[PDB]
Amino acid sequence: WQSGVHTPHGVVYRGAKMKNWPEQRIPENFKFTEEQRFRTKAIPRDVGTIPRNFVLGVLYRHQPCEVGGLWEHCTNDPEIVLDSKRHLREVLKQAREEGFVTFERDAISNEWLCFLTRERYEEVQRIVTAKSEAVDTHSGLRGAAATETSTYAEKFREMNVEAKEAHARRLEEEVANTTRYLRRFQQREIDYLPYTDLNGKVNFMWWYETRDVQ
Amino acid sequence: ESRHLPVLPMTPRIVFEHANEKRIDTAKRMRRDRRRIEELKTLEFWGWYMKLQRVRGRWCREQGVSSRGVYGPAVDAAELWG
Known about the structure:
The structure is cut from a larger assembly and holds chains A (214 residues) and B (82 residues).
Chain A: H1 3-6, H2 34-39, H3 50-61, H4 67-76, H5 85-98, E1 101-105, E2 112-116, H6 118-138, H7 146-161, H8 165-185, E3 186-196, E4 202-212
Antiparallel strand pairs in A: 1-2, 3-4
Chain B: H1 12-63, H2 73-78
Coiled coil (chain A): 161-188
Keywords (chain A): Coiled coil
């Protein structure tokens, strides 16, 4: 997508950029003709394992997820793999069809809140734990600072024993700052290739890498 | 009359019934194992096709082939025809 045409100028999504897609400026005077805008299409987005796992992890973190709240949490999270709100909606639809997410009109507020199916909650927990363990084992630098790890464990225990809402909010702010600082240099690129399965349905194979803009 | 265990005398009807039972069991077993073999063949063929697709994707990535027409990534970025 392009910021200047698909969205009002000045709107940018801090997600995962597509590989080789050029961010090209568009004049402010640009505007579609209504028939062309109706006839316009959209590139299919990834609805598979990694995006659904990321969305399920975001919901697992913030069990009550409003629309804007969910988008902001996804943007804040450093494991962003999505590309745009359209990709987020497609992933949410796929999860709903699989039977993971449930949407309810909250009594307190008209906004549609989101919950996770209890039957799939165990699966979500297993996915989250497996991802955390895999990241911990893969991170080579992690564990080099035994004192730092011990202090972090002490902080975890302190938060558990005390009220950890303020600690969680401060950690979310720090995570947002760190994600911005990371985005300043690195970026998660997405590279896709179309293919045709035996059934005759065109699908896309995707892979995500990390590139250092520097 | 007699107090021995109930034993059915061997008769053409009884032997025909046993033959029919064995034939039915044989047909059932043959079809079941045929279905199992076909399932294994389909599973391995799907696995091979997935491996083929992975190899094709790796080769296309190496060669810079996007398989999305002569146009560059700008058209896909526009997303006005995808």
